[PDB]
């Protein structure tokens, strides 16, 4: 995933165009988009060399 440049973190299988339609208020939808996009832009790993010590 890092070689492709794909976002290290997991990405849910979502279609936001459907979500922006389903929900009536944009606030929860925007917040949901805030979280996942932040999640996908972060590397969820720990240097295990340090953990092993």
């Amino acid at each position: 995933r890092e070689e492709e440049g794909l976002p290290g973190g997991p990405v849910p299988r979502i279609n936001w165009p459907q979500e922006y339609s389903s929900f009536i208020d944009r606030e929860p939808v925007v917040a949901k988009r805030i979280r996942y996009d932040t999640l996908a832009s972060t590397t969820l790993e720990r240097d295990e060399k340090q953990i092993e010590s």
Binding site: I34, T38, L39, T42, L44
Partner: protein
């Protein structure tokens, strides 16, 4: 020269048998005290969850 030697000779087999049994008992006790210690370590999923929370996500 005659009597004590004969009685020692008569003693030998039983003592040998009992000492062999005693050694087997020692080995059995050594084996019986062996237990494998399976340890439990904090799941890393919680650590990942804490990391996410610290990010304010």
């Amino acid at each position: 020269d005659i009597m004590v030697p004969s009685f020692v000779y008569n003693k030998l087999p039983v003592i040998h048998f009992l000492q062999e049994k005693r050694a087997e008992q020692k080995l059995r006790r050594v084996l019986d005290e062996t237990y494998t210690e399976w340890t439990e370590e904090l799941d890393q999923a919680h650590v990942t969850d804490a990391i996410t929370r610290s990010l304010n996500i």
